[PDB]
Every structure is written in structure tokens, then in C-alpha cells.
Design an enzyme around this catalytic site. Sequence first.
Site, mmCIF file in Angstrom:
data_model
loop_
_atom_site.group_PDB
_atom_site.id
_atom_site.type_symbol
_atom_site.label_atom_id
_atom_site.label_comp_id
_atom_site.label_asym_id
_atom_site.label_seq_id
_atom_site.Cartn_x
_atom_site.Cartn_y
_atom_site.Cartn_z
ATOM 1 N NE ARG C 128 13.591 -91.598 -36.876
ATOM 2 C CZ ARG C 128 13.288 -92.347 -35.692
ATOM 3 N NH1 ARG C 128 12.912 -91.603 -34.511
ATOM 4 N NH2 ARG C 128 13.862 -93.608 -34.947
ATOM 5 C CB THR C 132 14.397 -84.772 -43.288
ATOM 6 O OG1 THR C 132 14.090 -83.711 -44.131
ATOM 7 C CG2 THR C 132 15.203 -86.294 -43.957
ATOM 8 C CG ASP C 226 8.824 -93.403 -24.953
ATOM 9 O OD1 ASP C 226 8.584 -92.563 -26.340
ATOM 10 O OD2 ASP C 226 9.897 -93.344 -24.196
ATOM 11 C CG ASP C 229 8.464 -90.689 -22.203
ATOM 12 O OD1 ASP C 229 7.365 -90.469 -22.757
ATOM 13 O OD2 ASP C 229 9.365 -89.939 -22.425
#
Lengths: 235, 235, 235, 235
Positions: C128, C132, C226, C229
Site C-alpha cells: 500500500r 494514497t 499480524d 509477523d
Amino acid sequence: LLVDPRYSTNDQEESILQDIITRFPNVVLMKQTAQLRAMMTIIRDKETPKEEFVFYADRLIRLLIEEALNELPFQKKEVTTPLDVSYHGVSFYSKICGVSIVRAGESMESGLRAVCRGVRIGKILIQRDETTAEPKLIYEKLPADIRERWVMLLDPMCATAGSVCKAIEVLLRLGVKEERIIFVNILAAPQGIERVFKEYPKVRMVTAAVDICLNSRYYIVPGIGDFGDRYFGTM
Amino acid sequence: LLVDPRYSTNDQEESILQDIITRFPNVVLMKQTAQLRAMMTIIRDKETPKEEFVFYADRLIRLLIEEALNELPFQKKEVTTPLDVSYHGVSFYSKICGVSIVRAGESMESGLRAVCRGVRIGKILIQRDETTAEPKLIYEKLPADIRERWVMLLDPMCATAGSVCKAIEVLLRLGVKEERIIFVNILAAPQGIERVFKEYPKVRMVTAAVDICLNSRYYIVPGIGDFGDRYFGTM
Amino acid sequence: LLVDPRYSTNDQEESILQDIITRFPNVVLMKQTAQLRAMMTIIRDKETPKEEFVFYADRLIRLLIEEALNELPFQKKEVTTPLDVSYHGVSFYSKICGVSIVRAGESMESGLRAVCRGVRIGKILIQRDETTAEPKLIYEKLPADIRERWVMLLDPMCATAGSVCKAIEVLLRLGVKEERIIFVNILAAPQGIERVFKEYPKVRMVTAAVDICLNSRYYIVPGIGDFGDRYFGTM
Amino acid sequence: LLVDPRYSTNDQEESILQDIITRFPNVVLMKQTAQLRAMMTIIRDKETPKEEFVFYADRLIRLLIEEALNELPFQKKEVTTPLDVSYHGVSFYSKICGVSIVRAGESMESGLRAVCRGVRIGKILIQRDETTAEPKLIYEKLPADIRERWVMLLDPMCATAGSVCKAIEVLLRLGVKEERIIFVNILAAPQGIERVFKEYPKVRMVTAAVDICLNSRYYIVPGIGDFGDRYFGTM
Ligand SMILES: Nc1nc2c(ncn2[C@@H]2O[C@H](COP(=O)(O)OP(=O)(O)OP(=O)(O)O)[C@@H](O)[C@H]2O)c(=O)[nH]1
Ligand SMILES: Nc1nc2c(ncn2[C@@H]2O[C@H](COP(=O)(O)OP(=O)(O)OP(=O)(O)O)[C@@H](O)[C@H]2O)c(=O)[nH]1
Ligand SMILES: Nc1nc2c(ncn2[C@@H]2O[C@H](COP(=O)(O)OP(=O)(O)OP(=O)(O)O)[C@@H](O)[C@H]2O)c(=O)[nH]1
Ligand SMILES: Nc1nc2c(ncn2[C@@H]2O[C@H](COP(=O)(O)OP(=O)(O)OP(=O)(O)O)[C@@H](O)[C@H]2O)c(=O)[nH]1
């Protein structure tokens, strides 16, 4: 150095091997047994189908990883048998982690994960320049404490060594001690080994085979073709 | 006397090993690496938990089986690489099968099956008379054509060699050639090795460790305890 | 849309689950068994060690992959038993492949290679934008004939659905038929499910669970944290 | 109650299942999916090679064992997720063990050891007298505290149920509670299911399929043949 009697050796093989062994004390060649040779012929053969290529490749990776892990430090340890008698052994203790060079190297992650349950795995994505062809770090995800760990750098092939060298460069920058990096490799070219030990003389390298040369397209000869494409099936 | 320098051998262990390597040409001790000791000290430790014990034993067995598969015959083979160049390798011989000595021996089938998919597996359950104490053949299920194949006789321990000699007897009585039995073992006692090669001098033995002796209760020492019990959890 | 009695459900889970089931014909929820729940409990617990997290994750992945493979086409096939009596079964689809969204999705590659030996594996790395936040293609290596295949898109978490949607978009541009895409997912947010189907309604989605929401930082809640991770140990 | 529409069930299979599900409450039938059917058709086909038979059998036994574990008791548990919120899950019962009916049942051990690393494994060898035809106990090695555990009894086939009924008998004479026996099976015959429940009504039975009837030679039909011979390659 030693070549098993069973198989015939490719031209100038016994030579190159000894020369590498003598010139570079930090490289450790796996014992050239007939089994190893048997597995190598299967994965190097153009004709070998994908399911067979990854079965044997996984099989080999296993032997190779157990070989590499032998380069870690060991402490003396004494234990008692169920017979109540002492046995003088050793124990692994180091804080380790493996680091794969995106894609090709990932094929070695599972082999390492099979023997070391839950070992931390970093990942470095390198991309060579389109203009000059100079390795460029594209992406990387490494353990937060990699600087205090022994690193198992994973990359099946070592042709020009540009990828592994760049990988070692950043690894160093984040604080990883050069003499704590064990580069486990499957197939390598002489010029690639020199390049790496000319730049980073303290690293260790355990390979399974050293080939003759590189062609004008940077592929190892007799080589094995593109390991990444062959393994993941993106021919 | 190639014992990894990093650890200290058991008292009078290097002597025993020299003796066996000298007198028994057919025994093949696998490389005494620090890595191998690490595993041995774990499974030989009477404090080790079952989950850990089977994980490492499984791990060691993998290495032992790959080692043992080197004793099989090999056919030179030439294959062309993806770079259109010839590569001289070898080809796996074909008529083989695994035979485990029921219970303890079965723990090594996993390993054999991991590297040899679909390998035929025979079973032989030998047992000493509760009174008489001699080897009786209780049960056996072997491949119909075992007489024309190489046998990978599996049994982790070798103390008196009484049960493995009984096994080889029945195997021979079925037509399998003596010089085609590859006895793969994890831990052995000297007298055990002696007896085996006294009676069946043509077989091959692949082991990872040779301990010093047997105690009053016919247990190998330092030993590892009762392997089959510790492996299957029937402590 | 049904829950197992053994365990107590979370607030409105039975509610949210049925809503998703009836509202979206193309999603398939693994049967909510106590076993499945016991596994979600291990991997969701912030307290669970990394070895335990990957073990159960890998375990759950197996069941989720088998579940997803069921969404493939099937042909009737009659075979004959060793008892020379016919049995009416069905052979599976001939052309598939997996595609993992780099890193998190890679934890699933193994489970897929385990049941489908040698499956082709593609890889897509989406990142990403800091400002934006618009998902961007950073790297992609895919089979050359992906256009004529069914693809198992792999991504354990589906929060905003932005990255998976970006992944569908590129596949689509390369020529993959939208209705031949099977999105294998472990954990999803109602929000992500709606988005994926609003944009690409013909794709099928298989998941082990659906939580209640997302937080300011875009993590599913109660979520798992996550996944990338926690699985690779770079946390 | 379902039966995947994609495949054509064979003459009266739907009738048989209906009956058994109605008459026997304690029998758990795996979901009849196309995936499962596909595997069944592979291992039932007399033309399939031992490598493929072993692979698909292990795969199927894997799904089967997870299903059976669902029959164990579960204890509610609360865990705090990484998002710092609670999650209501469940806890695994803590006293189990597998028990193989020698040879045929040993093929399910690896599957059990795959999901339950370190599970204690008992073994029973029941052999029918060559003349009398009576099921006799030849050998047995069970965990010392099996009476305090839940036992997953392993045997891939159930034709007449003489063997299994004999195994349960010896288990009961040893102390294990009847209601703590989960009979995990791959294939079964209506006769077998009846006998086992006529004699031991409180045992739980989990299976992947129930065939039509028994052959004049006492073989399950359409059947698969001798599972142990096709598995271990001794036929
Ligand atoms: N060095 C080494 N360790 C091994 C091997 N096989 C298993 N291990 C074990 O794996 C461990 C390696 O260290 P890690 O567990 O990665 O250390 P760590 O990540 O700091 O430990 P945690 O903080 O709990 O996550 C050792 O404690 C060993 O007992 C092997 O071949 N080599
Ligand atoms: N000798 C040997 N063969 C191996 C090994 N790993 C895999 N294999 C393969 O496994 C086979 C071993 O032969 P067997 O399985 O005994 O052959 P077989 O029993 O006649 O085969 P069938 O026709 O199915 O009955 C070889 O054909 C090899 O390709 C290994 O380490 N050694
Ligand atoms: N669809 C499906 N096929 C499976 C599964 N498990 C095993 N298979 C087998 O694996 C095959 C899938 O192979 P693919 O990789 O698609 O074959 P391919 O892409 O044509 O590549 P090639 O072998 O070179 O032709 C099928 O032919 C099946 O027989 C499963 O769960 N689903
Ligand atoms: N019931 C159950 N337990 C599981 C499963 N998978 C893993 N486990 C774990 O495995 C254990 C099973 O019990 P055992 O280990 O046989 O108990 P035990 O043998 O008395 O315990 P120890 O004596 O220390 O070895 C449980 O403690 C679980 O946490 C599963 O699918 N079901």
C-alpha cells in the site's frame, strides 16, 4: 576433494573441487557420495517432471541444512542415561534465524523449518538493474533482533554472487556480524565463490556442488537451469 | 579417529571405535559430527519429554537411512542438463525393501518411507521365551518376492544381537542373500557387532554409535534406555 | 451458519455467520467444530509461542485447503475393485495452481504442496501507498498458462479486502476467468467479504471464520494480530 | 444426511447409510464430499500403484483422524487476543492414546502422530487360528495407564468385526471404560457395525464409508481388497 568411485566425474571436476577446498578454508563441501550424485542427476535432468524435481530437491535440501547447522557453535554438555550413567554430549544454544533470497531461497525455508520448528525467517527481495544490472533491494522483512543472531542465508544458486553479496551488504548494515553468516547453497560457480570471499572473507559457505563455469547468460554450467522456475513451476 | 573436536568423547570411546573399524570391514559408522552428538545427547537424556524424544529420533533416523542407502548398488547414468550439456551422474538400483523387527524396528519405517515413497515393508516379530529366554519367531509378513531384493533390516538397538541374528536366519531361510542385508542400527554394543559378523560375516551394518558394553540386565551402556518404550510411550 | 455446542460463542457470532451465509451464495464456511475452535484458540491467543503458532496454523491450513479443493469441478469415474466389482467415484480437475499474496499468503503454500505434490505456485507482492494507501503491485511471478487454470488465491487474512482485490485485478488482466478463482482464507471481516463480492461476485471464497470488525489500524477483531509477523517470526 | 450431488452413488448405498444412521446413534460418518469420493476411488481402484495408494491413503486417514478427535471431550477456555480483547474458545482433553490392531491399523499411526505429536501408541496383534478360525491375542504392548485414558482404536477395515471386538475385549479386561473407546475406521460393512454395537453399544465409531455387504470369502464389497497388503506392499 574426494569423489565417490561409483559415478564418473565431469571433466576437470576433481581438480576444481580441491582447488576450491584449499584456496577457501571457509567453504565446506558436502561429502560427495553416490546418493548425493543420484539426487543431483534427477534434479539436473531436463526431462525430470516437476513433482519429481521438488521431491528430490526437498530431499537434498534436508541433507544440506543438517550439514550447514554443523557450523554453529556448540557447548559441552553432560546428561544422564535412563541407566543412570553419564553421557558427555553437546547442546545447540545459539540464537539463530534463516534468511531467504526471495523465491529461489524460499524453497529452502521449509527444509529449515522441518528440522528447526518455528525458526524465525527473514526475506530479502533483490532485483537487478534494467540499465546497468546492479542489484537493488526491492523488499525485506527481517526479525527485529537479527543483529544478535547467527544467520542462515538461503539461496540455491550462486553464479555471479551479486545477489548474495548485496544481501550480505544490507544484513551487515543492520548490524549482523560478518562471521556469523552461514551461506547455505546447493550449486555454485567458481567465480561466484571467489567474489563472495573477496568481499566478505569471514562468512562461511556450505555447498553441495561446485560446477565449471557461467555462460554469457549468467547460468551455471552444466548447471541445473533456473532453480526458481523449475521448483515453483513458473517455467 | 575422525571424531568432531568440539566435544569430548565418552571415556575409552575412541579406543572401542578404532577396534571395530579395524576388525569389522563391513560396519559403517556414520560421521561423528557435533550435530549428531547434539541429537544423541537429547534422546539419551532420561529427562527428555516424549514429544522431544520422538522428534529428534525421527530426525536422526532420516540421516541414518540416507547414509545406509549409500550401501546399495549404483548404475552410472548420463543426463543432459537444461543448458544442453551432458552431466555424468548415477542411477538408483531398484529391487529393495524395508524389514522392521516389530516394535522398535517400526520406528524407522517412517524415515524410510519419507525418502522412499511406496517402498515395500516387511515385518518380523521375534520374542524370547519368558522362561527359556531364547528367540522365537512369533509373527512375520514379508513381500512375496523378498528373496530377489536387497533388505534394509531395521532395528534401533543391538545389544546381544540375539534377536537380529534370529531375524537374518528366517530371512535367509526364505532365500534372501546374506550379502544383500543392510543392517541399519542406531546404537550398538561391541559384543553385539561381534556376534553378528561371526555368524553372518557378509551382511553390512550401518550405525550411528557404538557404546562400551552391556550391564547385568543386558542393557547397552551408557545406552539410551528402552528405545521402543520411549518412542511409543509405553513407559 | 451453525455453531458447535461444546464451546460458547462470541457476541453475535451466530448472527453474523448466518447473515454472511445467506447474503453471499459464493462463500463457504468450514464446519464450526470444537476441533476447529480448539485450533483457533491456540493461534489467536497472544500468549502462544511461535513453534505452537506455526504448528496449529499449519494444521488448520491442511483442513482449510482440503475444504477449498472441494470447490473444483468433478467428473464421474467408474473403477473396479480388487474384488472385481465396480465402484462409482469421481476424478478431480486437471488444471489448477496456487497463487499466494507475498508473505502472509506464503504460509499456505506448504499446506497446498503437501496435498497436491508439485502444484505450480505463483506469487504476488502488493504494497500500500503511505499517503494514497492505494494497493500497488510490487512484484509478481506467475505460471505462464495461468489463463487456462483454476487458481487458489492464498491470503490468510481479509480485512479491508484491498490487497486481495488488487490481486484479483491483475489475475483478471492476465486472462484468468473470474469464476475460476477460489479465494482460500483463514480469517475474514464482514466488510472485506462484502467488498470482494461487490467487485468480483463470481469468485468463490472459503474461510474458517468471520469476525465482527476492523479497528483504526485495519486489524480484524477479535482477530489474530499480524499473521505474517506471527507465523514467520518477524515480530 | 447429505451426499454430494456431483457423484453417482452406487446401488442401495443411500439406503444402507440411511439405515445405519437411523439404527446406530454412535456412528459418525465423515461428510460424503466429492473430494473424499475422489480419494476413495483412487485407493479402491485395483489399477493404482503402491506409491499413489500410500499417498492418498495417508491423506484420507489425515482427514479421518481430525474428524475422530472431535469425539473427545472439550473444556471451555477464554483467551485474550493480540488486539487485547477476549475470545471464547475451547481446550483439548488431556488423556488420550492411539491403539493399533497390528499391521492394518499401524497405517493410521503416522496420521495420528502427525496431528498429535508424541501421542502414546499401544499395539495389539490378534490372529485367527489357522484351523479353528478363532480370533486370538498374539501380542500386546499398551501404555501402563491406558485405563485412565481415552483410546482411539485404529483399524482401516471392519468386515465381520471379530478382530476389533476381540481387541475391545482385551482393552476392557485391562480397565479402559467402554465409553472412552473411539473406533476410527476407513471402510465398514453393515454386519460389522451391527456386531460391534450389539456387543459394545457404548463405543463411538467414526468412519469414511460403509459398503454393501461381505463377500463369500468375507471381504467387504465393492471393497478395497486387503488394506494392509496394499499399504505395506506385501501382496
Ligand atoms: N542451533 C540449532 N538449534 C536447534 C537445532 N535444532 C533445533 N534447535 C533448537 O532451536 C533453538 C534455536 O533458537 P531459537 O529458538 O530460534 O531462539 P529464539 O528465537 O530466541 O528463542 P525464543 O525467543 O523463544 O523464540 C535452540 O534453542 C535449539 O534447542 C539445530 O539444528 N541447530
Ligand atoms: N535404490 C533406491 N531406490 C530409490 C531411492 N529413493 C527412491 N527410489 C526409487 O524407488 C525404487 C525402488 O525400487 P522398488 O520400489 O523396490 O521397485 P519395485 O518394488 O519393483 O517396483 P514395483 O513395480 O512397483 O513393484 C526405484 O525404482 C527408485 O526410483 C533410494 O534411496 N534407493
Ligand atoms: N483438482 C485436484 N487435483 C488433485 C488434487 N490432489 C491431487 N490432484 C491431482 O493432481 C493433478 C493436478 O496437476 P496439475 O499441476 O494441474 O497438472 P498440470 O498443471 O497440467 O501440469 P502437468 O503435470 O505438467 O501437465 C490432477 O491431475 C489430479 O489428479 C486435488 O485436491 N484437486
Ligand atoms: N485431546 C487432544 N489433545 C491434543 C490434540 N492435539 C494436540 N493435543 C495435546 O496433546 C495432549 C494429549 O495428552 P497426552 O500428551 O497424551 O497426555 P499425557 O500423555 O498424560 O501427558 P504427559 O504424561 O506429560 O506426556 C494434550 O495435552 C493436548 O494439549 C488433539 O487433537 N486432541
